[PDB]
């Protein structure tokens, strides 16, 4: 179905939806909480969603938007995530979820109805994956399904950060481009049929956790979708 | 292999190649040549294209610029495109061909060794394409081998409007979003493996074609490859 929605800064957050441990804060979405003297509380998971659902049948989309990743050590966790699910999709774990799962079916693709793309600041070994820090896409399980590596410059640089994310409804390819400020640019591509995976409604939003010393921040967010008949 | 390169304008130009109709003008890339009235000059073809060889094995490559479509009437003609070729690919026929194919193997996959992400302004029937304008991605051809409408109101909106393109050397995917202010977004996608078509050295760059009523300027261009070993 065709939707847009435009994002600036979040010194408007109108059709935004809050959950967990998310909240509108500094003209950003802050997806994970800090406490009273700004330390990030750990094992806390949040989401920030676009009230409205949508349908993915006959769609393309654009989505783009831009986070700070802030840090007070050099050992964060967990990261945060862009991700489309169904409109009841909830706040799921923290920690190296992401928000995004539940331990007893994290890697069981059958058990699953959620798609992302995940920045990953914290290499667990609770389950496959690189060895560094990792920028992925999932498809239906905390393994993701293509992965890169994500330079710790550009982890812990303080940037403005952007990334684009589209998918052609045609050839079915999900694609992400993540680009740093004179730092480092990120491409990974993927086919997978979303309408298959959703037939019905879906809405889109980000999910961050922690894990510790890591709060994440979106400070614009732009999509449009339209149809491919 | 391994290059990046950042023009944030065009106040200089070293390190571009440029050939035909194309030259450096007020800070930008002008493709196509005006007469001492200003007017396009008709039946002309231009590429500006970065100096510099890559080779495309084991490679991922993201690459942005931003662009102004110029048109002195309603009826513009041809358009321009980002393309990879050998690193002799020289100037070819002006009009639709976009200075990319010649009109006798234009449309005969093996005999050309070129890929390009086009932005048509002008429908060609002595081709198959489609009824509007639009934008394509072509591979060996061009007759498109993924096409997306083009929206007129963004075509003539002189609007500074933005194209990322990249491609996923694992997944084999190269993929162009391309977003106007205040105006449409477009996304495609498709599977070619570049390396398998590109054993050798390649250069990227641009190539514009007139046509009539139209010049197509570049007006920033940043560009980086990454190995995927
Ligand atoms: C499985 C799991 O969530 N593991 C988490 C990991 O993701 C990270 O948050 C870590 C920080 O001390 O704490 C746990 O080990
Ligand atoms: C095959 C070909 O190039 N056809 C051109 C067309 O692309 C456009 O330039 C038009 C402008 O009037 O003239 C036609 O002759
Ligand atoms: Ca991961
Ligand atoms: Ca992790
Ligand atoms: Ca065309
Ligand atoms: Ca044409």
Same mark, same amino acid.
Request: charged share 15%; aromatic share 14%; no cysteine.
């Given at each position: 179905? @065709?939707?847009?929605?435009?994002?600036?800064?979040?010194?408007?957050? @109108?059709?935004?939806?809050f959950?967990?441990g998310?909240?509108?804060?500094?003209?950003?979405?802050?997806?994970?909480?800090?406490?009273?003297?700004?330390?990030?509380?750990?094992?806390?998971?949040?989401?920030?969603?676009?009230?409205?659902?949508?349908?993915?049948?006959?769609?393309?989309?654009?989505?783009?938007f831009?986070?700070?990743?802030?840090?007070?050590?050099?050992?964060?966790?967990?990261?945060?995530?862009i991700?489309?699910?169904?409109?009841?999709?909830?706040?799921?774990?923290?920690?190296?979820?992401?928000?995004?799962?539940?331990?007893?079916?994290?890697?069981?693709?059958?058990?699953?109805?959620?798609?992302?793309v995940?920045?990953?600041?914290?290499?667990?070994?609770?389950?496959? @994956?690189?060895?560094?820090?990792?920028?992925?896409?999932?498809?239906?399980?905390?393994?993701?399904?293509?992965?890169?590596?994500?330079?710790?410059?550009?982890?812990?640089?303080?940037?403005?950060?952007?990334?684009?994310?589209?998918?052609?409804?045609?050839?079915?390819?999900?694609?992400?481009?993540?680009?740093?400020?004179?730092?480092?640019?990120?491409?990974?591509?993927?086919?997978?049929?979303?309408?298959?995976?959703?037939?019905?409604?879906?809405?889109?939003?980000?999910?961050?956790?922690?894990?510790?010393? @890591?709060?994440?921040?979106?400070?614009?967010?732009?999509?449009?979708?339209?149809?491919?008949?």
């Open positions: 179905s @065709e939707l847009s929605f435009n994002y600036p800064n979040f010194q408007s957050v @109108e059709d935004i939806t959950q967990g998310a909240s509108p804060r500094n003209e950003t979405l802050q997806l994970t909480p800090t406490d009273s003297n700004g330390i990030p509380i750990r094992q806390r998971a949040g989401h920030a969603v676009y009230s409205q659902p949508f349908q993915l049948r006959d769609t393309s989309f654009y989505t783009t831009t986070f700070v990743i802030r840090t007070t050590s050099n050992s964060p966790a967990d990261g945060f995530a991700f489309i699910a169904p409109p009841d999709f909830p706040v799921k774990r923290y920690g190296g979820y992401l928000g995004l799962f539940e331990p007893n079916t994290a890697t069981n693709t059958s058990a699953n109805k959620v798609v992302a995940e920045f990953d600041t914290w290499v667990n070994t609770e389950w496959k @994956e690189p060895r560094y820090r990792h920028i992925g896409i999932d498809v239906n399980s905390i393994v993701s399904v293509r992965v890169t590596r994500w330079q710790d410059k550009d982890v812990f640089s303080r940037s403005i950060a952007t990334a684009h994310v589209g998918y052609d409804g045609i050839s079915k390819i999900l694609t992400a481009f993540v680009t740093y400020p004179d730092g480092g640019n990120y491409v990974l591509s993927h086919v997978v049929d979303l309408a298959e995976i959703f037939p019905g409604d879906v809405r889109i939003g980000f999910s961050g956790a922690t894990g510790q010393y @890591e709060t994440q921040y979106i400070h614009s967010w732009s999509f449009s979708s339209t149809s491919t008949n």
